[PDB]
């Protein structure tokens, strides 16, 4: 019901790449909460744009001098500059960054800050384009985003890993019910699990994949390393048991089913088949209970509080 407004009226959406490409501004800033980092998105964007990204964190005067020299070099010979953690050099941000922004074509400068951190200067903030980085709330959209960033068994394992990562990152948002604490799984977890999957597939060339080994390593090392609670470790283990069971047919969600690859296709055919399955999947309205295998009354409270907060803020905004 909350998303009905933006679905029915607005027929377009903008990501970080679209904001960077479709703006006449050389200065960008990125904000996010704690335990969420979005610099890998800028790394991917600089790779896709055939640019050079210079990443300079701001904690010490040596880093500040290096940032000044690299900014001076970038204004003349192009290149992309990322300033991580600008709120830990607030005096430098208030003086040098303010002066430089106040006074090359392929030059772009990015600043990474915190939404819940110290306040940035308003004249500096108003002169740069502003984005907020956060995970995609949808599950199917998360699988599509993970799938669009990529023999046949490697493709199948990457599809299963995208599904598992989307399910666990959607489950992390339901703090009391999906887990017990607040955990943050990210592209590092996805990359480490993908490297482990490729290593298992390379070291087992007889196509007898150790699915129990894959389940236990993903549940205990790659994703269970951050977990310090036994109940949440069991939650991750049960999710791995559902996803990486290694059966002939796998119904990852009650809607769609993922058949295992045959022995007479190619990697492009497997990619096209899995993309067709992903396109033919429809996300239901009760996805947080049907797809995460949770009772409906657990997610109903969370959805009702979210909608109540959103609609109350809308009512207060409209009353003025």
């Amino acid at each position: 019901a909350l998303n009905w407004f933006k679905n029915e009226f607005f027929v377009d959406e903008w990501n970080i790449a679209d904001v960077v490409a479709n703006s006449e501004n050389n200065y960008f800033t990125m904000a996010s909460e704690r335990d969420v980092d979005g610099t890998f998105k800028l790394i991917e964007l600089a790779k896709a744009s055939k640019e050079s990204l210079k990443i300079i964190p701001l904690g010490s005067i040596e880093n500040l001098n290096y940032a000044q020299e690299e900014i001076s070099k970038s204004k003349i010979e192009g290149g992309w500059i990322l300033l991580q953690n600008i709120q830990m050099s607030l005096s430098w941000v208030k003086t040098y960054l303010h002066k430089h922004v106040e006074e090359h074509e392929k030059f772009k400068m990015f600043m990474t800050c915190h939404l819940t951190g110290d306040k940035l200067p308003a004249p500096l903030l108003q002169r740069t384009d502003r984005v907020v980085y956060e995970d995609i709330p949808g599950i199917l959209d998360t699988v599509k985003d993970l799938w669009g960033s990529q023999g046949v068994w490697s493709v199948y394992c990457t599809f299963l890993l995208s599904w598992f990562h989307a399910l666990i990152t959607a489950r992390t948002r339901l703090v009391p019910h999906g887990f017990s604490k607040k955990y943050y799984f990210n592209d590092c977890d996805f990359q480490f699990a993908s490297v482990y999957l490729e290593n298992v597939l390379a070291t087992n060339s007889t196509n007898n994949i150790p699915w129990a080994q894959v389940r236990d390593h993903i549940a205990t090392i790659v994703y269970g390393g951050k977990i310090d609670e036994e109940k949440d470790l069991e939650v991750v283990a049960k999710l791995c048991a559902h996803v990486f069971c290694g059966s002939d047919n796998l119904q990852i969600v009650p809607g769609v089913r993922i058949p295992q690859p045959l022995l007479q296709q190619s990697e492009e055919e497997e990619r096209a088949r899995l993309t067709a399955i992903l396109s033919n999947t429809i996300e239901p309205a009760d996805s947080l209970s049907s797809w995460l295998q949770l009772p409906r009354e657990s997610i109903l409270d969370y959805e009702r509080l979210q909608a109540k907060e959103v609609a109350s803020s809308t009512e207060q905004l409209l009353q003025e």
């Binding site: 980092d37 904690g59 991580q84 390393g225």
Partner: protein, 1443 residues
Amino acid sequence: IQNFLPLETSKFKSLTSEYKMITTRAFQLKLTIDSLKMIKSSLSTFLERQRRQFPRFYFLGNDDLLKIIGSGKHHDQVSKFMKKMFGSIESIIFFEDSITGVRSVEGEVLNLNEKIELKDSIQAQEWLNILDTEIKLSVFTQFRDCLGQLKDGTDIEVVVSKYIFQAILLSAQVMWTELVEKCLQTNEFSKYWKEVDMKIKGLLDKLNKSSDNVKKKIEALLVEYLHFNNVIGQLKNCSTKEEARLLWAKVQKFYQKNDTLDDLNSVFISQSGYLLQYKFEYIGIPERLIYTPLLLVGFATLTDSLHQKYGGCFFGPAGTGKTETVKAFGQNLGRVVVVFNCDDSFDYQVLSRLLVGITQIGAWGCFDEFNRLDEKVLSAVSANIQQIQNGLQVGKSHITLLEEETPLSPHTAVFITLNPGYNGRSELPENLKKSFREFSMKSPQSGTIAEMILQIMGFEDSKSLASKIVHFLELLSSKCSSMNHYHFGLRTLKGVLRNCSPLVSEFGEGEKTVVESLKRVILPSLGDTDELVFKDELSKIFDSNSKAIVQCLKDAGQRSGFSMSEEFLKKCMQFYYMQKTQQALILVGKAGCGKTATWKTVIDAMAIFDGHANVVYVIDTKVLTKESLYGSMLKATLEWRDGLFTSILRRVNDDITGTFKNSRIWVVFDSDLDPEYVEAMNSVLDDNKILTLPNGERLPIPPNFRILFETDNLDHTTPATITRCGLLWFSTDVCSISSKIDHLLNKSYEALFELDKLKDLISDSFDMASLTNIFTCSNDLVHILGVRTFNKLETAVQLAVHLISSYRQWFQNLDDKSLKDVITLLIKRSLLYALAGDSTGESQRAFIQTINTYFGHDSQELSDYSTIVIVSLEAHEVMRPDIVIPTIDTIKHEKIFYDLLNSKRGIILCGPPGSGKTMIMNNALRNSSLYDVVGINFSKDTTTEHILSALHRHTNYVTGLTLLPKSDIKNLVLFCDEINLPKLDKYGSQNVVLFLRQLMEKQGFWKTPENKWVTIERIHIVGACNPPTDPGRIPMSERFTRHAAILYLGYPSGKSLSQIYEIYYKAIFKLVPEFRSYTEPFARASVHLYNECKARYSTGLQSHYLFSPRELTRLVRGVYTAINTGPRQTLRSLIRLWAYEAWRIFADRLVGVKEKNSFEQLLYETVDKYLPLGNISSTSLLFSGLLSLDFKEVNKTDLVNFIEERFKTFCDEELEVPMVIHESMVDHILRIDRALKQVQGHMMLIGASRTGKTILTRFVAWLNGLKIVQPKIHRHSNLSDFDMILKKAISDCSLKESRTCLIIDESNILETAFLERMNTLLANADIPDLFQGEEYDKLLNNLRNKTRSLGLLLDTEQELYDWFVGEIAKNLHVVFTICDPTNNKSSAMISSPALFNRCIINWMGDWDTKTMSQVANNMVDVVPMEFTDFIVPEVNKELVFTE
């Protein structure tokens, strides 16, 4: 190497020639050290370049590195640094002019394959590289021979004694891996399980029958063989081949390549499919961790992160196995893990230099407590960590950190261990957390650890004993009290198991040893009821000779004066048993409960028992800063400066004279435990036993080097430091009242034909039965600054012994009854002034009555004013600040103060402001020629440097190093006016109060640069304070206040204050004898006015409404001054003058118009009541000496015309500010003139902005001829510029006799150091910080020549400095301008004690309606404005502010 720098070589040759000439001149019958250091500091870049040849030189200091290059032929200087460079190697074995082998820190000898021939032309690093390679080749050769022999069916029990432990370990691991894989090729494990079990039993028998080195080897091998047995049993119990392969995938497999010709990379380790290379580095025989599931999963996480070339990360609570698990992973991977203890002193340069060192070496660097770094430093090194990561991933040959392209070894790995969730610990940023792969280590397997440890130690029922121990620990953690220092986790279990090792030889390997070790570890940390809980649960879980050390303890106690009670003996035995295996101890209890007595007695007893000398250092932790306790780096020179603890440990480790070989070293931290301070020593306290420094130095902790922590509470202390140290808990005091009195009496006797008779008579008069009743009755009184009756006994005994011994000349002319009477009377006086001496007068009288009624009526009666025996002032004398009206309370207070000062006891004078503490101190010490007074006035931000600067011109430093006064006859008295005001830190510690406690207790302190102990010889400390109930007052530490005698000063009563002030009024009225009979009504009127003002205007209205007898003194001085410089007075003029001075002294600080009208009606009531006159309003009392040659009441119109013409002249001469004249600015001008005509007359102007404060100060100062000095303080202006302008103003004011007015705005106080400087300037007459070093000598000679030019005969520095401070007090006036009184810095300015007590507050406020109407009507009357008809409106009277 000298030819590289020719000028430096020539300078070195000249210095060496000069040194040789000096040595020849000395042998025939300072500057050398300076010449050595001036080229040594130029050798820092040379040593830094030398560090890149052998990269392990980063683990050495500059001095150690200089020794390494300097040992060009001896080669034995290198052998004593192997533990620093390598970690596992202790010394190098030398024979036949060659490197025969190396010796590990456990004593194991690794013989090389071939000798390394040492030539004189080979550099130290040149042969160190050869040694480093040959060690790895030798380890590989030993492993290859052991594996080849084991593969031929040879049993391990005959090759344990042949090869090194690392060789046997790797060969056994490879054999076990291949044989288990062969067993997995089938489905049979029973035969191999039985074979491994019989191998374990045979190794246990050989452990029973071996020597020390073979015993260590077998003890370390049994860990891995029990791990092998556990894995084989787990695989045997698997039901499915897939399940068995799943279990075998997640363990560490050990293989050997058969085709690679490169020998050092022929062994790799496989776990969960990932391969890691063995390094073959020598590890010795380290302590091996018991293999647990948590250990194996952590190994798998580390393997995964190192396969991706990421960083390893472990997080969890303290004492779980993070650092040791990283070290054990490195040991299994064949290398020594370098362990760093991170700190807030580890900045970006330090962290990056450590990363450069480990990346050049190739070592695995573990950074423990990575979240103790600052957040900025954590963010800054993220790029460096990512650079190391990417270089390791892509195989880059070099990386660029710290502006230098250094080589990157492919063997490097970065590990961090952190403990989130505790206070004072930062959070890692996300871009840094994505560079590491974290793993939770919350719950270790303590049952498995204890079971295999007891099995290796040889206990008969290891599984049952481990189950009992772990159940007992969990049960204790469940049902003991929930206070913060109870921890019964893995570190407690390890300590329990380590005390089982030396107890078996007397108690047998079993439950008795386990119970006695549990009582040795856990019992001293428990309380009263927790001890009974421990005993009951120990008795219900488990089934069930120290005469020499008890006798040694008794000998130490009765040589030091203590008495051995049951509790004191129990605490002493507990401390002696805990120190045996635990190298770090914490003694916690109440203040003055017996911690110092306990540990001093135990170490004296152990010195007697063993013959080992004890070297004791007592360091007060929070008196020193952290960079002075551990050390700091000079960024201008990159040179390390040793801290105090670092210097002590370095001296112990170096041991130049050899005195520390057969001695025990005790370092006592006698302060409250700050986690910031003590968590920098976590690697010292734990099993690493190393002191990691920011410059890479590594100081080992010798076994005879023990650290003591003496503190009073553990509120802020973290479990990370609680668990690493054994804790001795003091539930109650270790001494009784009678025993404490006996010990104190014996101590006082030892400091002194009639001596034995005096001792017997005093000890008989100290009747404990009558004493304990008044001791338990004194607790019902109200005591300000509450010190316990147990701690007042030192004051009582010292005062009684001093008062008795001061009358030794007159003890041979009286009989025994009178002698007993006078001794008992002095005992009553001492008991009163020690027990109830810090209470009110009523409580003191009640305690006198209880003392008299409880000591019996037959003895001599102590009265209110009991003592033992063998005013008309002047008009010019009322202005003297050193004159005191003698009253009975003043005489009594001076007598008890002098007695307590002569008793060599610290004194604290508590009381309300203005009560007379400073007055009675100065009056008591003015008539004494044996004492000198230095006055230090503390603020909220006082440092020990301020105290040392105040002690600079009075004391001398003579060398050991003692601090004694310059005068050889008079002693020195430290007066500290506000000991309640210095602020706590964020953990609640007062640096100045701890420094004063250090001085009072230990009679000295430590010098922070040079780390030398200073001794206090003849300096007494006298404290003054306000009650802690007052705002801004902080309760002082009981550890400090228990060392001082507290005397409560009170306000004099109404009649007492009257009788004080009629004498002042009589001395005033000697100038006017025609009104001599009015002294009584004037003084009663003044005292009643003060009482009424104090009752009406209080703190509850506004914070600065504080009144005292200082206000009455100001009224007396102002009345005298105005009478003296005025004309002939009548009664009406005298009453109006008293009303005017009362206005300017009591009500210039009033803000409300209602309060000012109330003060006006109060003056009317007081005058009508006491002195039976026109209007006495503030605008109707215009007294000024501006319009004539004398101070008199002047006409308003003539005053206004005078101000008009003088201000026209002022604007035409100095600054054109075209203002307009009104009555409020006029009487503000008059009161500013009154304050600026005074001596020590300071103003604090408070009012709205653009009211006229600064311009009126300038106009009045121009009227009085003062020199206006406004400091040019702006942005980017600091304490250096503030001190420069203050010193310039003070110097001009004193030397040039320039009368100076100093206008200080609120905006000029950038930080609170400015306010502290102004507090020093106004409390004293100068700042001791400005004139020190060469500046003191420059000031002294300038004062000498100025005084000689002025024709005054002053020679001594005391006289010259007295003339200096008198000139500044005469010729300097300070005016403060405050615009917004509600700011935080303005509130700190107003509530400042020196500025409040010294200045005259003039609350100008904002303009009112009359002033605004006058200003507007007076500057709109000059325009043509009445050019039209105007109809007067009909409005209300209240709506019209004008006429």
